[PDB]
Amino acid sequence: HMLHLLEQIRAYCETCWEWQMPAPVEHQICPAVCVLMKLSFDEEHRHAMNELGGLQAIAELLQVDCEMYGHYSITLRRYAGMALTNLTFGDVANKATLCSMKGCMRALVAQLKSESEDLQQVIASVLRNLSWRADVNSKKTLREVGSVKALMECALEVKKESTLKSVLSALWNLSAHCTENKADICAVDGALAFLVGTLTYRSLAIIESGGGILRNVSSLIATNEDHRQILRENNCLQTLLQHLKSHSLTIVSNACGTLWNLSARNPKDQEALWDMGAVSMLKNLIHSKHKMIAMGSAAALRNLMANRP
């Protein structure tokens, strides 16, 4: 039965490809992908889905629909992306495969502009898994298609927490890939205030992944005084110091790396950190069990103790 549906996906795609018009409502396209999306949640069905080329069929249907039109149209992309989500989770193979389908990738990135924020939650979940533990090829295609710029721009307009959660998680992975990516984040207007804005997120995953992005990109901000001032007017260093007391080891690790970048090569933030208590607050963490916390703690402290004022 799994075999039967994947052929219907191809058949309809062929018909669309024979035009390159048909509408998706005419060939049971959404119910076809919905069952496949539903069945993609089980591990045993996934091994059969990979071996019939279901990942390839579902991706191309997503891609064709986008190339054609740019409710039914939206909902097929939903389930298709939902299925792709289930199909990339922990499958190293499917990750490079989908990341090599450049046209489908371009189509995926394009969907971060759609009227459905629910679809945006779905796409950014595809982009999360793709970026997470990506191979050297995958990191390139993600960069070439402009995943960083689009996801960072998507972050500023999204309302729902579940959507942003996945957007920020993709960008946390994507920033660590290369400095070219880091530059795309800092280049977006109103992005650095939002990343400081996520450090004090009321409704911890958002604070982790957002302070993760900032942590990565702070190597470009440390040189950039104008960008340091956006952090200042949004009181970022004060918040970073409060993070040092946090329950989440991921947040404390974030703050350290971020602070280690910012505590160097700038007189004003150095002096501010002294006036806030960065010496004692980073000193209580140098004997910590964890590398990253022990790494950043004295690393930022060394930048400060060498620059008394």
From Swiss-Prot:
It is found in: Cell junction, Adherens junction; Cytoplasm, Cytoskeleton; Cell projection, Lamellipodium; Cell projection, Ruffle membrane. ARM repeats lie at residues 36-74, 84-126, 127-170, 171-213, 214-258, 259-300. Phosphorylated; phosphorylation enhances the F-actin bundling activity. Phosphorylated by GSK3B. Expressed in a variety of tissues: brain, small intestine, colon, thymus, skeletal muscle, heart, prostate, lung, spleen, ovary, testis kidney, placenta, blood and liver. Isoform 1A: Very strongly expressed in brain but has relatively low expression levels in other tissues. Isoform 1B: Predominant form in all tissues except for brain, including gastric mucosa and blood. Tumor suppressor. Promotes rapid degradation of CTNNB1 and participates in Wnt signaling as a negative regulator. APC activity is correlated with its phosphorylation state. Activates the GEF activity of SPATA13 and ARHGEF4. Plays a role in hepatocyte growth factor (HGF)-induced cell migration. Required for MMP9 up-regulation via the JNK signaling pathway in colorectal tumor cells. Associates with both microtubules and actin filaments, components of the cytoskeleton. Plays a role in mediating the organization of F-actin into ordered bundles. APC mutations have led to some interesting observations. (1) the great majority of the mutations found to date would result in truncation of the APC product. (2) almost all the mutations have occurred within the first half of the coding sequence, and somatic mutations in colorectal tumors are further clustered in a particular region, called MCR (mutation cluster region). (3) most identified point mutations in the APC gene are transitions from cytosine to other nucleotides. (4) the location of germline mutations tends to correlate with the number of colorectal polyps in FAP1 patients. Forms homooligomers. Found in a complex consisting of ARHGEF4, APC and CTNNB1. Found in a complex composed of MACF1, APC, AXIN1, CTNNB1 and GSK3B. The complex composed, at least, of APC, CTNNB1 and GSK3B interacts with JPT1; the interaction requires the inactive form of GSK3B (phosphorylated at 'Ser-9'). Interacts with APC2. Interacts with DLG1 (via PDZ domains) and DLG3 (via PDZ domains). Interacts with alpha- and beta-catenins. Interacts with AXIN1 (via RGS domain). Interacts with ARHGEF4 (via N-terminus). Belongs to the adenomatous polyposis coli (APC) family. It is linked to Familial adenomatous polyposis 1: An autosomal dominant cancer predisposition syndrome characterized by adenomatous polyps of the colon and rectum, but also of upper gastrointestinal tract (ampullary, duodenal and gastric adenomas). This is a viciously premalignant disease with one or more polyps progressing through dysplasia to malignancy in untreated gene carriers with a median age at diagnosis of 40 years. The microtubule tip localization signal (MtLS) motif; mediates interaction with MAPRE1 and targeting to the growing microtubule plus ends. The basic region (residues 2167-2674) mediates the association with both microtubule and actin proteins and promotes the bundling of F-actin. This is Adenomatous polyposis coli protein. It comes from Homo sapiens (Human). The chain holds residues 407 to 734 of 2843 of the full protein.
